[PDB]
Design a protein around this ligand. Sequence first.
Ligand SMILES: Nc1nc2c(ncn2[C@@H]2O[C@H](COP(=O)(O)OP(=O)(O)O)[C@@H](O)[C@H]2O)c(=O)[nH]1
Length: 352
Amino acid sequence: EATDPNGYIVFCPCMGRFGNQVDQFLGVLAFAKALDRTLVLPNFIEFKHPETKMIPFEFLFQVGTVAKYTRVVTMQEFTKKIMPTVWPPEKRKAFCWTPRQAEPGCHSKEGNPFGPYWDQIDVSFVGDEYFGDIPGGFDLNQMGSRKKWLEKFPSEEYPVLAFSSAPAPFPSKGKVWSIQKYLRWSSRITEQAKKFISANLAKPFVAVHLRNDADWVRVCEHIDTTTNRPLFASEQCLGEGHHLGTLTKEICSPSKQQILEQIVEKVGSIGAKSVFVASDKDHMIDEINEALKPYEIEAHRQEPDDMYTSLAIMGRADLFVGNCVSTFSHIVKRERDHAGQSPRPSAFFGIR
Ligand SMILES: Nc1nc2c(ncn2[C@@H]2O[C@H](COP(=O)(O)OP(=O)(O)O)[C@@H](O)[C@H]2O)c(=O)[nH]1
């Protein structure tokens, strides 16, 4: 019915894959609340055979729950009710930090997933706006920055702030992690997880995330122990600014030997009766089963490995062993920390 007189934020989760998108989305939630505009829930993005698939927020997560954090609308609602009445085509401007080259601009629809995401909701942009000139950019907790935002893009002139990418830092700040208390798997996904667990995973079970597709080597080449800077999600196991210790290649990219040894250790730590493995490539089922044979238990995977059901299963594990650098693992860690009545235990490869 009524539309928000403070205006709206819509954005493309245009950086990285699902872990990346969620990580920034928590920040966008914090941003929308502080600014006090209603957030249009994004379509998440999945890169497949030839196509870029936009996934409705509500296919993955419950709107009811996220609405307990801040004012939200589904993309379906935005497209049907809000856009036709508050955001006519002549007012559709894109927002980004600073102009860049392909005439310099936001280039909000150049390439993949940029073009397809906006095509999905029949948005073409008629002009660009920049916010990078505001001191502290999208950090609304810098004194004066919020006032400056409301001065530069008032809701009367700009009913919809439409961002080329998430208006949030990457990696996420520690202060926003607990916001994923407000992300709850759709019933569909939770039921797929529950069925796999009851059929295949005698309790208590250890769930492990094996991050090992071809893009990972380069990720872990980033590690230099002398400077010990945060790398993607590493602060999830080493604390903000790595106050707990040193990021190592053993943490980022454990060897097969190290993986098997630590699975065995974690099985023994809980008297586990089964192991679940989620992986982007090599689930190591044969190697793990061989390593677990003296202990008369097995490892199990989904066939095929659906990334969302996999995250949900790892969230329900008695013990989760994740990859500390991975933002995909970070989703599980944050669910285990914040989703429930009380926190459920997590561990990571290479960290004591
Ligand atoms: N099916 C499945 N896919 C995965 C798994 N781990 C990674 N992936 C894929 O690889 C992407 C990794 O990107 P991202 O989620 O941002 O996490 P990060 O790169 O590990 O920080 C995921 O979003 C998935 O598309 C897994 O355990 N199962």
